[PDB]
Amino acid sequence: IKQGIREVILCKDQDGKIGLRLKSIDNGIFVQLVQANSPASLVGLRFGDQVLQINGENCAGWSSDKAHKVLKQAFGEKITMTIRDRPFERTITMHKDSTGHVGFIFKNGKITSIVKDSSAARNGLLTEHNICEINGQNVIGLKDSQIADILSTSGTVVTITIMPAFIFEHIIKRMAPSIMKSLMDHTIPEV
């Protein structure tokens, strides 16, 4: 989680798409969805990012509908955004034990218990938190087994980016659970 504000310069693709859906939360605007192979994924926009400005206009108090509208009406060639990095999320670093375990249970991407004497216990992992990212990779809407799989095939060091479930549940309302599975960028960023 970078500790403040960065500028990103965005270029609509051939189809006039940027690959972003936005959600109004507590009078801010937040990234609900980033599409794979979009301008938004290429410049590195992430689920949970806050949009402060769009072309130097403040987003404070905008509806989801109005932010989508501004984005369409932009003059294509160059959209500037001011971004605050994943403000609702935190990152925890854990170490697998010799049995390949970090030490938690989860259900639908939500952590539901912390196992005694684990790395998750030692690092203060919390329940009622949704897994957003594993080792920088967005895992939102993947089945539980694919998350377990990504955890299996991680090295012994495991970074997990989590979000309070009440906030998570507020951001994803009105995005069908199959779009999450199907259309949220789950790839490792390109260099």
Curated annotation (Swiss-Prot):
Coiled coil: none annotated. It is a peripheral membrane protein. Residues 7-86, 91-166 form the PDZ domain. The keyword Electron transport does not apply. One of its GO terms (biological process) is positive regulation of cell population proliferation. Changing residue 107 to A: Disruption of the cooperative binding of C-terminal peptides from FZD7 and phosphatidylinositol-4,5-bisphosphate. It is found in: Cell junction, Focal adhesion; Cell junction, Adherens junction; Cell membrane; Endoplasmic reticulum membrane. Keywords: Acetylation, Cell junction, Cell membrane, Cytoplasm, Cytoskeleton, Endoplasmic reticulum, Lipid-binding, Membrane, Nucleus, Phosphoprotein, Repeat, Secreted. The keyword Cell membrane applies. One of its GO terms (molecular function) is frizzled binding. It comes from the Eukaryota. GO terms for cellular component: adherens junction; azurophil granule lumen; blood microparticle; cytoplasm; cytoskeleton; cytosol; endoplasmic reticulum membrane; extracellular exosome. A 1,2-diacyl-sn-glycero-3-phospho-(1D-myo-inositol-4,5-bisphosphate) binds at residues 108, 143-144. Expressed in lung cancers, including adenocarcinoma, squamous cell carcinoma and small-cell carcinoma (at protein level). Widely expressed. Expressed in fetal kidney, liver, lung and brain. In adult highest expression in heart and placenta. Induction: By IFNG/IFN-gamma in melanoma cells. Phosphorylated on tyrosine residues. Multifunctional adapter protein involved in diverse array of functions including trafficking of transmembrane proteins, neuro and immunomodulation, exosome biogenesis, and tumorigenesis. Positively regulates TGFB1-mediated SMAD2/3 activation and TGFB1-induced epithelial-to-mesenchymal transition (EMT) and cell migration in various cell types. May increase TGFB1 signaling by enhancing cell-surface expression of TGFR1 by preventing the interaction between TGFR1 and CAV1 and subsequent CAV1-dependent internalization and degradation of TGFR1. Monomer and homodimer. Interacts with SDC1, SDC2, SDC3, SDC4, NRXN2, EPHA7, EPHB1, NF2 isoform 1, TGFA and IL5RA. Interacts with NFASC and PTPRJ. Interacts with SDCBP2. Interacts with PDCD6IP. Forms a complex with PDCD6IP and SDC2. Interacts (via C-terminus) with TGFBR1. Binds to FZD7; this interaction is increased by inositol trisphosphate (IP3). Interacts with SMO. This is Syntenin-1. It comes from Homo sapiens.
